[PDB]
């Protein structure tokens, strides 16, 4: 077992330059010695800490170690204090090169292709033969689904509002995290994110390097013409327009899109895909789903034009389709549901979708440049609109977006996008988002890990479902502020919160597979569960954590921790503990999204 270095650092380590602020473990208030030590022992260089006292958060005293004027490459860096009396009076090793970021810039991606269903897991794409696996629900016993799914059983106790009984063919698509469910809502801000960040490269100019180009990942397609990244994006796009319901299914909704299609009833850990024996079926249809549809869908029909007209064209017409069935049935809502006991799926409801409309309607606008888009898209209340802070669930809790607060994503798309919108709220738009990254640049000084959060608004408040990924979506706002501005203080932040990702945290847990001293090493999924039984293999490196979350809302986490263990302590790497250790698409998007921007920054 490892001890945990009273001086927290990026596992892995720093880029050579730019801010860098370890955190210790000193209840000794009172400036104390610090001196970084390369391999070899020799000190490098010294001076003392910064006093900050008992961080709210985790319930430690620290001190901050601030050694941005340091910049010398190498290998093996590890600080350490003289003067203090403890056993773990130091850091774990770590660099400062520039290729910190190279890699796992690509194992981010490459949990896209991983997670792919319809389709087999094959070498070299893998990057490990303990990876393959059969192709997941592609019909084929014990499989019972994807290729004809019916739409949820009517006498089912959670059945949702009533649907008419036919079948579709689902196949294709991602998988959302350790289960076999695929749903557009979720589905929806991971596969933007993805597109996002391509059209991020497109319009500055570096399409052309590392993944966004053909050949640019270790996927199937690599070599197919298209860009790289948009093969992944596709594969989830492919499964979004199968989702959207015909004439011939049910004429009353038309043209709107299924919530989501998983299991009838929950599984366990430690199966494949295609062993998966559960009846697969339907959820009932959401405006929030068919606006994420038409959304991603108005985004995909811009950037893939220029590379397969026909794809580009049909996704187009299929974005109009939904935004104007969600007009006719702007308030169908996905209800909630047991956690456990009841659907084999997740829940993802929400009761408020003018976010959503807001989203689509930045997106159809920016593609169409349309009249009844921009109309929908300035008399908003949401117009030009980049939460700092949030607010149902997302009420209070501090970030720019989550799944199901849509606003924002559509905002960075009118920021960094073509539209002919006045260029004067194209600069409010620029400027909010600066002004959100502001607020949470602070939250990091009064924050003893600098992390960009600070517990929710919601009076119960702690860290939520998946509190790292808060931290991912913040980072992306700051990395565009750091676009529009040129003011270094944006990528600190960034740099803050990714370190706090990799090891300075409270936990000295490194949120992230394959990386670090003390690694993620127990995902919750249901394939890389070694915990379960050692017949299943540690998952691919580059995947992030749920992280910390107080709410204690799976078994595991309940039994692990006192009632009182500080929010950002409220964590504990078990391939059970679901509400604290999970993967998801909505997670590693938008960590790809950030390994990519630190890599080309340097
Ligand atoms: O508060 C809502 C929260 O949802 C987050 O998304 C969740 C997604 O909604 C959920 O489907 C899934 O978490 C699953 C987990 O994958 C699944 O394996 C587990 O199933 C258990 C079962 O409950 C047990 O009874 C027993 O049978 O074992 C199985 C397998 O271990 O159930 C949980 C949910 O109960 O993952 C998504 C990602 O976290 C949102 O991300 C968050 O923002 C929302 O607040
Ligand atoms: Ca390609
Ligand atoms: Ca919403």
């Not at 811009?302 to 935004?323: G, M, Q, S, V």
Request: hydrophobic share 35%; charged share 20%; glycine share 10%.
């Amino acid at each position: 077992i490892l001890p945990q270095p009273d001086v927290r650092v990026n596992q892995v380590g720093y880029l050579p330059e730019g801010k860098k602020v370890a955190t210790v473990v000193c209840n000794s208030t009172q400036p104390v010695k610090w001196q970084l030590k390369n391999a070899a022992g020799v000190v490098v260089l010294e001076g003392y800490t910064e006093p900050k006292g008992l961080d709210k958060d985790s319930q430690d005293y620290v001190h901050w170690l601030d050694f941005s004027d340091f910049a010398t490459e190498g290998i093996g860096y590890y600080f350490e204090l003289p003067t203090v009396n403890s056993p773990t009076n130091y850091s774990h090793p770590f660099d400062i090169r520039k290729d910190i970021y190279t890699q796992m810039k690509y194992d981010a991606l490459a949990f896209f292709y991983h997670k792919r269903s319809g389709i087999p897991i094959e070498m070299p794409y893998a990057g490990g033969e303990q990876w393959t696996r059969p192709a997941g629900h592609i019909g084929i016993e014990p499989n019972k689904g994807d290729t004809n799914v019916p739409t949820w059983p009517q006498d089912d106790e959670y059945a949702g509002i009533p649907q008419k009984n036919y079948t579709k063919d689902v196949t294709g698509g991602w998988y959302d995290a350790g289960d076999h469910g695929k749903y557009v809502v979720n589905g929806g801000i991971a596969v933007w994110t993805l597109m996002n960040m391509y059209e991020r490269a497109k319009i500055r100019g570096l399409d052309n390097w590392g993944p966004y180009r053909d050949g640019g990942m270790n996927i199937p397609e690599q070599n197919n013409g298209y860009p790289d990244i948009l093969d992944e994006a596709r594969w989830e796009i492919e499964f979004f327009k199968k989702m959207q319901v015909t004439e011939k299914e049910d004429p009353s909704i038309a043209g709107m899109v299924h919530h989501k299609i998983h299991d009838f009833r929950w599984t366990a850990l430690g199966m494949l895909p295609h062993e998966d024996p559960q009846p697969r079926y339907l959820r009932p249809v959401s405006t929030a789903a068919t606006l994420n549809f038409a959304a991603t869908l108005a985004q995909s029909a811009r950037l893939w034009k220029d590379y397969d007209p026909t794809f580009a064209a049909d996704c187009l017409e299929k974005a109009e389709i939904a935004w104007q069935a969600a007009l006719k049935h702007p308030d169908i809502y996905a209800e909630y549901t047991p956690g456990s006991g009841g659907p084999g799926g997740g829940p993802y409801n929400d009761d408020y979708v003018g976010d959503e409309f807001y989203w689509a309607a930045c997106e159809l606008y920016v593609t169409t440049g349309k009249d009844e888009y921009k109309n929908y898209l300035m008399n908003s209340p949401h117009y030009l609109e980049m939460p700092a802070k949030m607010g149902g669930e997302d009420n209070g809790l501090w970030g720019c977006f989550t799944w199901g607060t849509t606003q924002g994503l559509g905002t960075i798309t009118l920021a960094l996008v073509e539209n002919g919108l006045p260029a004067t709220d194209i600069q409010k738009a620029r400027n909010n988002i600066a002004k959100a990254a502001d607020r949470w640049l602070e939250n990091i000084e009064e924050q003893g890990y600098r992390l960009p959060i600070k517990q929710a608004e919601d009076e119960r408040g702690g860290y939520p479902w998946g509190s790292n990924s808060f931290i991912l979506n913040q980072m992306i706002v700051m990395g565009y502020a750091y676009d529009f501005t040129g003011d270094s203080k944006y990528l600190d932040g960034m740099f803050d919160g990714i370190s706090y990702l990799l090891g300075r945290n409270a936990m000295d847990q490194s949120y992230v597979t394959g990386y670090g001293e003390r690694p993620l090493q127990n995902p919750h999924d249901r394939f890389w569960t070694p915990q379960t039984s050692k017949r299943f293999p540690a998952p691919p490196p580059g995947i992030i954590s749920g992280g910390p979350n107080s709410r204690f809302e799976d078994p595991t986490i309940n039994a692990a921790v006192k009632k009182d263990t500080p929010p950002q302590k409220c964590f504990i790497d078990h391939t059970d503990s679901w509400g604290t250790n999970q993967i998801t698409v909505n997670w590693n998007a938008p960590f790809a999204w950030v390994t990519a921007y630190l890599d080309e920054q340097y």
